């Protein structure tokens, strides 16, 4: 159904476990309250996903040095690559809100890190593109990912107090994930 | 005056330049509007720094796996290390708000990265402590650094609209810096 999407079936145990996740949740101040509100964020965002994708890919597409990461060697955007990734990105919005953050979730977080990194970039879709996404931009993107989501959370007729709690949960969850995705980028033993 | 604080006098040119910084600012959505409001954040936070430090170090100190990074080999917090770092952290609050983000600023961002990493950790204060701060926690800390600051920004009798703009500027600036600090942690050529 979603080409290349292998959540829960990588058959590869990540190099981090639930104890690692507990300590990382503590560092990012994520608790059971955020679990509640991230789920509620999923209810709000579910039927706005197409517009979210348009916004997100609009941001990427308007910056040549960002759109770069989806380009063919000739410098033009690879439209097959963009379309296939867009489907998996859309699903990630739902996963972030709806999935339990358990070992299967960690195993896919390792996978997503590997796919941004040179280790696995451009293999899932069998495309020819740039070899690596510089780690600096994964961290930077914590901000726009959070900023893209804010207006959409405010839209579904929920209380502003609930909106703030959903937004903070989303900020924490995005930060948590990017922290895990540093694994293949970071010198062994420094993560 | 501040022991170990060597901003603007490292005499070492960072491996990133103003073009790198321009592209990273674009990725984190930082503009001249944020320059304005981060400066205004500095006016607000200046006379609350002691309370900010208490909050921040309170968070670190209440989590044994975080306080770990300041511990002597015997597992007890090194109080000399805590005190010396606290002075440089306090100054960093002001620097973030007040400094122009120019080459000198980049050169100190490289330095701060090096000091969290095993490359330079525990050398500035000539202490014996744990060798490295795992990069996962630098990313994670983007959230509490931003969450610690929010209440203080809301305190100095400014409009809530200005408060929101100061807070967003602070979020962007913190993310920007952590992205740069990945440099010594990231495999060469993957940053
Ligand atoms: C907060 C930061 C980021 C988030 C949340 C994010 C999210 C995602 C997701 C969910 C996927 C699909 C994962 C899967 O295969 O199931 C993906 C892949 C991809 N992302 Fe990101 N991403 C981030 C940073 C970046 C940056 C900075 C770029 C640069 C434009 C980028 C470009 C791409 C590309 C090119 C792929 C395809 C990688 C491949 O060949 O498999 N991502 N991203
Ligand atoms: C957003 C993330 C972080 C920020 C903004 C931050 C800020 C700072 C600053 C401003 C300094 C002093 C720099 C200087 O020497 O002038 C410092 C040093 C230090 N920080 Fe962080 N820090 C972050 C992440 C962390 C984490 C996750 C830990 C773990 C507890 C930590 C523990 C320390 C320690 C132990 C030092 C002393 C390093 C040395 O030996 O030189 N920091 N930090």
Residue numbers in the entry:
A (entry chain A), B (entry chain A): 5 to 195
What does the original paper state about this entry?
Protoglobin (Pgb) is a recently discovered haem-protein with distinct structural and functional features that make it unique within the globin superfamily. The MaPgb* structure can be considered as an expanded version of the 3/3 helical sandwich typical of “classical” globins (i.e. Mb), with an additional N-terminal extension, built by a 20-residue loop, followed by the Z-helix, which precedes the globin-fold conserved A-helix. Residues belonging to the Z-helix contribute to formation of the Pgb homodimer, which is centered on the intermolecular four-helix bundle built by the G- and H-helices of the two subunits. Thus, in Pgb the access of diatomic ligands, such as O2, CO, and NO, to the haem is granted by two orthogonal apolar tunnels that reach the haem distal region from entry sites at the B/G and B/E helix interfaces.
To verify whether molecules larger than azide could be coordinated to the MaPgb* haem-Fe(III) atom, imidazole binding was tested on the crystalline protein. The structure of the MaPgb*(III)-imidazole complex was solved at 1.38 Å resolution (one MaPgb* molecule in the asymmetric unit) and refined to final R-factor of 15.9% and R-free of 19.8%. The structure of MaPgb*(III)-imidazole is well superimposable in its backbone to that of the MaPgb*(III)-cyanide complex (rms deviation values calculated for 190 Cα atom pairs ranging between 0.41 Å and 0.45 Å, depending on the superimposed subunits), and their dimeric quaternary structure are identical. The azimuthal orientation of the haem-Fe(III)-bound imidazole is staggered relative to the haem pyrrole nitrogen atoms (lying at about 15° from a line connecting the methinic CHA-CHC atoms), with a haem-Fe(III) coordination bond of 1.97 Å. The haem-Fe(III)-bound imidazole was refined in a double conformation (occupancy of 0.5 each) with the imidazole N3 atom pointing alternatively towards the Tyr(B10)61 OH group (2.69 Å distance), and the Nε1 atom of Trp(B9)60 (2.64 Å distance). Additional stabilizing interactions are provided by several van der Waals contacts involving the hydrophobic MaPgb*(III) haem distal site residues, such as Val(B13)64, Phe(CD1)74, Val(E7)89, Phe(E11)93, and Phe(G7)145, surrounding the haem-Fe(III)-bound imidazole. Overall, the haem distal site structure of the MaPgb*(III)-imidazole complex superimposes well with that of MaPgb*(III)-cyanide. Small differences occur in the position of the Tyr(61)B10 OH group (a shift of 0.75 Å), and the rotation of the Phe(93)E11 side chain around the Cβ-Cγ bond (of ∼13°). Thus, the ligand sensing mechanism of the Phe(93)E11 is preserved and the Trp(B9)60 side chain is properly oriented in the haem distal site cavity to stabilize the haem-Fe(III)-bound imidazole and to shut tunnel 1.
